[PDB]
Write a protein that holds these residues in place. Structure first.
Motif, mmCIF file in Angstrom:
data_model
loop_
_atom_site.group_PDB
_atom_site.id
_atom_site.type_symbol
_atom_site.label_atom_id
_atom_site.label_comp_id
_atom_site.label_asym_id
_atom_site.label_seq_id
_atom_site.Cartn_x
_atom_site.Cartn_y
_atom_site.Cartn_z
ATOM 1 N N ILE A 7 41.616 48.861 42.552
ATOM 2 C CA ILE A 7 40.686 48.623 42.245
ATOM 3 C C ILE A 7 39.625 49.019 41.406
ATOM 4 C CG2 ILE A 7 39.853 46.468 44.023
ATOM 5 C CD1 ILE A 7 40.733 47.253 46.358
ATOM 6 N N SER A 8 39.311 49.602 42.015
ATOM 7 C CA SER A 8 37.999 50.458 40.481
ATOM 8 C C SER A 8 38.148 50.925 40.055
ATOM 9 C CB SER A 8 37.726 51.797 42.411
ATOM 10 O OG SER A 8 36.241 52.077 41.682
ATOM 11 N N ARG A 9 39.874 51.889 39.575
ATOM 12 C CA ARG A 9 40.425 52.045 38.580
ATOM 13 C C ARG A 9 40.853 51.385 37.788
ATOM 14 N NH1 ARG A 9 45.077 56.051 36.712
ATOM 15 N NH2 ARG A 9 44.028 57.580 36.026
ATOM 16 N N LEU A 10 41.306 49.914 37.958
ATOM 17 C CA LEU A 10 41.662 48.625 36.660
ATOM 18 C C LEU A 10 40.727 48.540 36.248
ATOM 19 C CD1 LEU A 10 40.978 45.358 37.026
ATOM 20 C CD2 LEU A 10 43.398 46.148 35.912
ATOM 21 N N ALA A 11 38.856 48.457 36.835
ATOM 22 C CA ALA A 11 38.062 48.036 36.624
ATOM 23 C C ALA A 11 37.204 49.304 36.221
ATOM 24 C CB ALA A 11 37.028 48.142 37.691
ATOM 25 N N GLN A 12 38.070 50.544 36.022
ATOM 26 C CA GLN A 12 37.530 51.555 35.276
ATOM 27 C C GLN A 12 38.082 51.641 33.462
ATOM 28 O OE1 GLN A 12 36.630 55.827 36.485
ATOM 29 N NE2 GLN A 12 36.081 54.629 37.878
ATOM 30 N N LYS A 18 37.480 50.670 25.135
ATOM 31 C CA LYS A 18 36.497 50.438 24.086
ATOM 32 C C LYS A 18 36.464 48.262 24.240
ATOM 33 C CE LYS A 18 33.953 53.930 22.594
ATOM 34 N NZ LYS A 18 32.862 54.149 23.052
ATOM 35 N N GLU A 19 37.159 48.516 25.847
ATOM 36 C CA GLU A 19 37.360 46.517 25.783
ATOM 37 C C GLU A 19 36.215 47.000 26.652
ATOM 38 O OE1 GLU A 19 39.341 45.033 23.813
ATOM 39 O OE2 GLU A 19 39.298 43.973 25.627
ATOM 40 N N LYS A 20 35.847 45.407 27.747
ATOM 41 C CA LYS A 20 34.419 45.156 28.562
ATOM 42 C C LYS A 20 35.356 45.302 29.481
ATOM 43 C CE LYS A 20 30.567 43.576 29.901
ATOM 44 N NZ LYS A 20 29.788 44.631 29.872
ATOM 45 N N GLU A 21 36.004 44.221 30.313
ATOM 46 C CA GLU A 21 36.599 44.319 32.269
ATOM 47 C C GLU A 21 37.369 42.772 31.757
ATOM 48 O OE1 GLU A 21 33.277 46.673 33.027
ATOM 49 O OE2 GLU A 21 34.336 45.748 34.621
ATOM 50 N N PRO A 22 37.533 43.037 33.406
ATOM 51 C CA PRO A 22 38.770 41.710 33.847
ATOM 52 C C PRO A 22 38.144 40.477 33.655
ATOM 53 C CG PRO A 22 39.111 43.550 34.041
ATOM 54 C CD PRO A 22 37.724 43.973 34.190
ATOM 55 N N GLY A 45 44.429 40.728 28.698
ATOM 56 C CA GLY A 45 44.166 40.844 28.051
ATOM 57 C C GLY A 45 45.494 39.819 27.707
ATOM 58 N N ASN A 46 46.563 39.556 27.830
ATOM 59 C CA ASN A 46 47.388 39.138 27.754
ATOM 60 C C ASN A 46 47.808 38.167 28.858
ATOM 61 O OD1 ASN A 46 46.853 40.647 24.960
ATOM 62 N ND2 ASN A 46 47.910 38.879 24.275
ATOM 63 N N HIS A 47 48.026 39.809 30.009
ATOM 64 C CA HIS A 47 48.538 39.107 31.270
ATOM 65 C C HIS A 47 47.904 38.624 32.145
ATOM 66 C CE1 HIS A 47 52.421 40.279 28.678
ATOM 67 N NE2 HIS A 47 51.773 41.571 28.795
ATOM 68 N N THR A 48 48.515 38.902 33.643
ATOM 69 C CA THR A 48 47.927 38.321 34.799
ATOM 70 C C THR A 48 48.668 38.503 36.335
ATOM 71 O OG1 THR A 48 49.361 35.825 34.937
ATOM 72 C CG2 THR A 48 46.735 35.651 33.397
ATOM 73 N N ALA A 49 47.733 38.446 37.336
ATOM 74 C CA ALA A 49 47.884 38.683 38.620
ATOM 75 C C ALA A 49 47.324 37.598 39.823
ATOM 76 C CB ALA A 49 47.947 39.729 38.864
#
Length: 74
Positions: A7-12, A18-22, A45-49
């Motif tokens: 969760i924290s790793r994905l956000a990080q 150089k992207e923003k956030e989910p 970006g191009n995929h979902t959960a």
RNA sequence: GGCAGAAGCUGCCUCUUCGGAGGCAGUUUCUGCC
């Protein structure tokens, strides 16, 4: 490897490429006479959960286990 | 000087058609941008 929860790793990771956030969405199109639940959808970006929970701070954390396996961080 | 993202451990509230739903904090840790 890793040093954090899914969760924290994905956000990080989004901040390190150089992207923003989910981005996250509430579905809850359900309406059965004897079953209800929260249902969440996220995009990276191009995929979902997807995940489920009991409030807007608890469905987000259950989908996270899939959020690495959807774009290539498995 | 200012802005942005997430959680480990612990705690709280309201509704319920009796399926269940809706919502938060405290404490501690990591990260990005001007």
């Amino acid at each position: 490897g890793s040093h954090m929860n899914p969760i924290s790793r994905l956000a990080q990771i989004q901040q390190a490429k150089k992207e923003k956030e989910p981005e996250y969405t509430l579905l809850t199109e359900r309406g059965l006479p004897r079953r209800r639940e929260f249902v969440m959808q996220v995009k990276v970006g191009n995929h979902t959960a997807e995940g489920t929970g009991t409030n807007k701070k608890v469905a987000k954390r259950n989908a996270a286990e899939n959020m690495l396996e959807i774009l290539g961080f498995k």
